[PDB]
Amino acid sequence: LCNDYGYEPNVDYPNASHAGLYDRSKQPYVDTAIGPKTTIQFDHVFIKSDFKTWLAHNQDEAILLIRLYELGLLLQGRSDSFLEFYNNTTYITRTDSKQPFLNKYGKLVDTTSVTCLDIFLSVVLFALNQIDSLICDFKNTPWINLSKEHKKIYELVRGIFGICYGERFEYCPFDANSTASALNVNATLNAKKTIELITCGLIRALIAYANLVTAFSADKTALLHEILLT
Amino acid sequence: LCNDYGYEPNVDYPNASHAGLYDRSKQPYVDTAIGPKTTIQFDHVFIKSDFKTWLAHNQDEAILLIRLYELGLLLQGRSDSFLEFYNNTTYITRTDSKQPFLNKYGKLVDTTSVTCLDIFLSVVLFALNQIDSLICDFKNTPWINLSKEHKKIYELVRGIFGICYGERFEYCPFDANSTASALNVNATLNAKKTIELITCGLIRALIAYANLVTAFSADKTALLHEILLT
Ligand SMILES: [Ca+2]
Ligand SMILES: [Ca+2]
């Protein structure tokens, strides 16, 4: 008969299990730290959040999604949020290359309400869908032709995934004059390279989002269960 | 002063608005049809479901996700579910190429419980993550080398997105003997083509999943709100 049937004292008592001899957890006792940074709430009913755990284990990808939130703000005409987005960073020198986004990441981790987090994911998905629609338009004919709206999106999204302006192999050193002919040929190569940089950014962001929103959805099931007793 | 401030009788009374002169809805009155196929429930508290609306507007993509559910079952050792998955189709002739998946689609649309739908999405995400991990392994060196587990996934996922066996341009008609040399060169091209077919299937499935699970998450917020009064 099966020996794993739902009786698991080590799962019921995780802090005591971290004192055992066979615990392999990478950061023991973190799994029981409780505060705004590890919970969400609905109607001030709190749960330990898979969504918050994801943000912590995946800071780099979280910052990718936050940059897409900022894109979403601009495309939705949220002018003040966009223009104040890098405020209150304190430093007059460079620090981390993504400093303003790290700061926003800390504030997202500190957000507990379902209402606020619903807004975050909604804007991110809006941005993801805009990028997908752009790629489909770009690739629907070999001769590149974009809708007016997608021409705008193209440049904004290129500024995130590249080709990043100002950040050598196209010059023809054997006959510099021939570079003029090369530029014509390479203009389409640069646009196609941009779309591949955007496409491979989208896939990374989609895998992150798929997992993050599933964790959030799971958190909401836990809230639905807990609320029935509270 | 703004004239769109939250008073919208045409949104409050949609059936009456469908009798107006400026309704552009593509299938008027469908938005108010209420049954298992358009709702979900938690604790027998029902809401009109964005998740169910998505499945209806996106049947083709829903079937893509259902095929990934079936993959997830096999990889999770759910043997009976996998082997009975095409049962009860009734016909002794061909009909729609995706008949067993259409049938499962109808049963998914008929599923109302959050508990059951959580299971569906969890298995689909499991499959999506397996495919992503495969692609990353495949591409992490130009010389192709896959983990033992990914070699198994590769063949299973190739059977979904291609290259599909048994479903002409590689032969060398000028010197058929040289085809033997071509096969060696083309083996890597066929594996790379397979991964691109898989990669472009993953992106389509991820965009579908991202939108579907966000709609489900939104539905759960509506449940959280409704339950507080019920
Ligand atoms: Ca186009
Ligand atoms: Ca490898």
Domain boundaries, position B93: 38-229
Q: Which residues pair with B41 in a beta bridge?
A: B46, B113
> Positive or negative, the Cα torsion across B53, B55, B59, B61?
positive
Residue B70: burial class (beta carbons within 10 Å; 0-12, 13-18, 19+):
buried
SS3 label, residue B70: helix
- Domain annotation covers residue B100: yes
The count of domains in chain B is 1
SS3 label, residue A5: coil
Please report which ligand is nearest the Cα atom of B141.
Answer: 2
> What single-letter DSSP state applies at residue B47?
E
Q: What tokens appear for A128 in the block?
A: 């993801």
Closest CA to A53 of A31, A26, A70: A31
Is B137 among the annotated ligand-binding positions?
Answer: yes
Report whether B72 contacts B127 (CB < 8 A): yes
Amino acid at site B18: H
For residues B84 and A219, what is the distance between their CA atoms, to the nearest angstrom?
Answer: 32
SS3 label, residue B45: strand
Best of A207, A212, A223 to mutate (most B CBs within 10 Å, chain B): A207
- Domain annotation covers residue B25: no
For residues A112 and A132, what is the distance between their CA atoms, to the nearest angstrom?
Answer: 30
- Domain annotation covers residue A20: no
For residues B122 and B164, what is the distance between their CA atoms, to the nearest angstrom?
Answer: 27
- Domain annotation covers residue A85: yes
Using alpha carbons only, give the angle A68, A73, A76 rounded to the nearest 5 degrees.
Answer: 120
Least CB–CB distance from B214: residue in A115, A125, A207: A125
> In Å, how far is B135's CA from the nearest CA of chain A?
11
For residues A170 and A112, what is the distance between their CA atoms, to the nearest angstrom?
Answer: 50
CA-nearest residue to A211 within chain B is B125
Ligand 2 centroid to Cα of residue B196, in Å, is 15
- DSSP H or E run through A47: strand A45-48
Whether A199 sits inside 8 A of B203 (CB atoms) is: yes
After which residues does chain B show a gap where C to N exceeds 2.5 Å? 167
- Domain annotation covers residue B5: no
Amino acid at site B71: L
Q: What tokens appear for B65 in the block?
A: 């996700």
> Positive or negative, the Cα torsion across A194, A197, A198, A200?
positive
Residues from chain A that touch B227, judged by Cβ atoms under 8 A, are 224, 227-228
For residues B18 and A83, what is the distance between their CA atoms, to the nearest angstrom?
Answer: 41
Which residues fall within 8 angstroms of residue B181, CB to CB, at 6 or more apart? none
User: What region, left, alpha or beta, does residue B46 occupy, with left being phi > 0 and alpha being psi -120 to 50 degrees?
Assistant: beta
- Domain annotation covers residue A23: no
Q: What tokens appear for B97 in the block?
A: 């190429």
Technique of determination:
X-ray
> What single-letter DSSP state applies at residue B113?
B
Please report which ligand is nearest the Cα atom of A145.
Answer: 1
Least CB–CB distance from B118: residue in A132, A216, A221: A221
> Positive or negative, the Cα torsion across B109, B110, B113, B117?
negative
Specify the resolution in Å. 1.7
Q: What tokens appear for A5 in the block?
A: 């049937």
For residues A17 and A15, what is the distance between their CA atoms, to the nearest angstrom?
Answer: 5
Q: At what angle do helices B148-161 and B59-75 cross, to 10 degrees?
A: 150
> Positive or negative, the Cα torsion across A134, A137, A143, A144?
negative
- Domain annotation covers residue B171: yes
Closest CA to A56 of A41, A42, A39: A39
Closest CA to A156 of A87, A76, A63: A76
The dihedral over CA atoms of A20, A23, A27, A28, expressed in degrees to the nearest 10, equals: -30
Which residues fall within 8 angstroms of residue B160, CB to CB, at 6 or more apart? B67, B68, B71, B201
- Count Cβ atoms below 10 Å from residue B48 Cβ, excluding itself: 15
Whether A213 sits inside 8 A of B211 (CB atoms) is: no
Is B140 among the annotated ligand-binding positions?
Answer: yes
Ligand 1 centroid to Cα of residue A75, in Å, is 20
- Count Cβ atoms below 10 Å from residue A141 Cβ, excluding itself: 8
Binding-site residue numbers of A for Ca(2+) are: 137, 140, 145
Residues from chain A that touch B122, judged by Cβ atoms under 8 A, are 214
- Domain annotation covers residue A122: yes
Closest CA to A121 of A42, A211, A46: A211
For residues A32 and A183, what is the distance between their CA atoms, to the nearest angstrom?
Answer: 58
Whether A207 sits inside 8 A of B132 (CB atoms) is: yes
- Count Cβ atoms below 10 Å from residue B158 Cβ, excluding itself: 19
Is B186 among the annotated ligand-binding positions?
Answer: no
Report whether B45 contacts B225 (CB < 8 A): no
> Positive or negative, the Cα torsion across A66, A72, A74, A78?
negative
Please report which ligand is nearest the Cα atom of B150.
Answer: 2
Least CB–CB distance from B224: residue in A199, A213, A220: A220
